[PDB]
Write a protein that binds this ligand. Structure first.
Ligand SMILES: [Cl-]
Ligand SMILES: [Cl-]
Ligand SMILES: [Mn+2]
Ligand SMILES: [Mn+2]
Ligand SMILES: [Mn+2]
Ligand SMILES: [Mn+2]
Ligand SMILES: [Mn+2]
Ligand SMILES: [Mn+2]
Ligand SMILES: [Mn+2]
Ligand SMILES: [Mn+2]
Ligand SMILES: [Mn+2]
Ligand SMILES: [Mn+2]
Ligand SMILES: [Mn+2]
Ligand SMILES: [Mn+2]
Lengths: 184, 184, 184, 184, 184, 184
């Protein structure tokens, strides 16, 4: 099994991540941001990744630093887990709904960071989670993983549905990309 | 094999449906609506479903009641055939052409009915079939199956091509969703 | 292995093509048009086709006749390699990025030629290659192969990225379409 | 005399075509689509082709499959009749009226299929014939004959006049293209 | 030779017309309207018709009645000359320039009168000739000959050029239509 | 046979032209501009002219002077070959396609130079040939031949197709104009 682990401490946050690319969907995420924990559970269940995350940090300032540092660490953990990338599909492409929401994700484990993102989340807070932080989560993850990632909102009105459908589609695309190509 | 069967009688229609999710594309549909029979044949052949349908009803009023009651029964038959949904992909996503027509279908066997539909069929009758009835077929099927279904017209000009490409894409997406996930 | 071979001589060009549908990505293309050679290498590597091409011709007039005659011959070679089409997926659908570029390709090995193409390539020359020739390459290939092909630009700014992403997506869609359907 | 004959059977249609390029306008067409029979009579009379067509098929679904399969077979019959194309004009260009309708047709027996078509037929049914099927007739004929064909509506309001003028102009252009060039 | 002759007297005009369809371009027209005489000379020379016209009438009121009655008589003379129409092309199509002017004429000797006319003559008088009378000349000729006639201005700025190019194109189209079809 | 020959030397260019109006399509053109050579070959083959051209000149400055001086000399050669114009059609009118391109040419060998030209060539270079030079070629040819020439782009997207279709249509119109009128 391909397992990547990262521990990172700043003056703002303390983060530990462990991801198994060849998992069974074991979800074990506690970031101090409940909505992000919910999305990381989606990542595990829809991607069949095992996801272990612990974070503490300066959430009294806002969720930003924690969200960013968790994302950065996940990207690095993914990079480590991938190793030499031998024999993998490398590309993933999936479009997933959640009720009225429909989100397309296309990615390439390319070594060149890029985020294309056009979500229009119509409310500012989902629970206590600042919806600007969704883009920053994916941007930071891309930057440390060296992923080419396109996220396209095809439909959606409920903010929780839009974000959750994004994580479902991303997880399924990433599962595809990380799985073995039977002809390689 | 996962087989669902439904018999339903109203004062307007008499309907019998049997669907095998694990079929070989056996097509055996006679609804009293020839264009709908043609589309149900597409469902079987493109989905590798075995599809048996018989309907009679008040087509002298219009095809509406028959079309609706057939769709409702198909949705219920699908629901029955699925049973506990164990180990299935659950999600399907396919884009199929028919010449100049190009139709994207994304679905989730979620238990929550939703239809997203944006087809713009530029003629009122294909053969003797009222083209408004395409949307109603999918809406009714969604309602009894508890499916999340998005149908997106990406291209198309000929009405028969648009509708037929929709059924090809839907069938292929539904095949995917109903098939076993090798890691589940 | 399914191998198609075509030799074609005009007063303008001399072309030889050999394609293995069941290949390992062996790339061996020399057309007299370096950018086209680069794209044919992408076809091989991303499609797992073995691609052997030799062409000479009137490139001092412009690359047009060579580009066209190579494309025509590739389409015929594909047609020959496919034979009776027994047991194949027939349909392919893939969306691939290259950095900021994102290209969707959907195809059906239908026997009816059709090209849907909406690329907007913002420069006139990539290297010494006239970017109008990309459309003509796909049109000519479609015409002799009898393929239904839709190419959709979803994002992109760099001309080389747009064209190369197109070839990646086309190759992956064509691989899918030509591969065996495990239930057929 | 240059005679081409085609017999083609599908699960949808049974078609037989025989065309003499060097005819006297003998019209003998029975397709199961009366309006199409009327247009094929125009082809014979205005083109001085001898045209023999028989078709049966699934017209209870709609006229589409019959219309398409007849057109495909006519294109192949034309291709066969043309043989090596020695000494022919190859190009045809004619503009014909029918009362207020005025239709320009330009064609080249090039070996490269292309349809340019801009008819705007303002009603959905002429008799029982779906007017979308006019474009599909010419597209399918082009595809199997390998013809470059441009059809331009210059004037017209009555749907029957527009379609019939198209067939008159096409027939006269095709007569020209297929006739001997006295200097070749 | 096919010769038609008409004499017609009203309280406004006295008209005599003789036209030979199989002529040598003999021009012999004196209508009392010099510009119309010039156009009738063009008809003869460009059409290879022999044209004999004499008219007198109420030109002190305006040229209208003479222009109309001459046109009516020419249409009848053409009708008479045509006789049974056996073996003729029947259709004519020609586009002729005169310097910057370019005029397309398409006609069918159909037995159903129709004029399609879109000339935009930018001055009110050419010499002493009222330029509204050009349309009325063709309308009246169509009405008595039973001709389908389309006149299309493709280019032009000088009024004399526009009108004269119209007569050149009409004459050449009419020559074609009235000539023998070698296969009929 | 009607043969015109012109030799012309400037400080910029050396040009020799010989054209046979009553030719067999013998193509023998070497101008120092490969794309122009290709178009002159089209002139010969589509017009059944014999075309002999030799030019050298200052192509390191740009192709302009050579293109212009070749065109001027061709116009003069045509003028010389025509002689007294006895018995010729004088007018030509043809519309030719090349795939998606469709070009109408109408001309009159009038003795009055005029070019009407509306081509919109969407790229700046076809091969190494500056596409502005197409208009200048026809303008210069018109000026020395004393031709009335209208060139109308009816359709087209590929620059090579647009230009080549223009030369096909021009050649066929010029063949018509230069041929004998059987009634003159
Ligand atoms: Cl899309
Ligand atoms: Cl036009
Ligand atoms: Mn930040
Ligand atoms: Mn949720
Ligand atoms: Mn209803
Ligand atoms: Mn069908
Ligand atoms: Mn080409
Ligand atoms: Mn590259
Ligand atoms: Mn069709
Ligand atoms: Mn009719
Ligand atoms: Mn009046
Ligand atoms: Mn004049
Ligand atoms: Mn100049
Ligand atoms: Mn060429």
């Amino acid at each position: 099994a391909r397992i990547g682990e990262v521990k990172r401490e700043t003056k703002e946050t303390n983060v530990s991540v462990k991801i198994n690319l060849d998992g069974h969907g074991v979800s074990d995420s506690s970031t101090g941001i409940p909505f992000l924990d919910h999305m990381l559970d989606q990542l595990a269940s829809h991607g069949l990744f095992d996801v272990h995350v612990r974070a503490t940090g300066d959430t009294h300032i806002d969720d930003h630093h924690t969200n960013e540092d968790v994302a950065l660490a996940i990207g690095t953990a993914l990079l480590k887990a991938l190793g030499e990338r031998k024999g993998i599909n490398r590309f993933g492409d999936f479009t997933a709904p959640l009720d009225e929401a429909l989100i397309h994700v296309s990615l390439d484990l390319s070594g060149r960071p890029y985020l294309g993102y056009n979500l229009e989340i119509p409310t500012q807070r989902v629970g206590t989670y600042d919806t600007q932080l969704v883009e920053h989560f994916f941007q930071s993850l891309v930057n440390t993983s060296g992923m080419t990632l396109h996220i396209r909102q095809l439909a959606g009105k409920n903010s929780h549905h839009i974000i959750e459908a994004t994580f479902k589609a991303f997880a399924r695309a990433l599962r595809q990309a990380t799985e073995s190509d039977p002809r390689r």
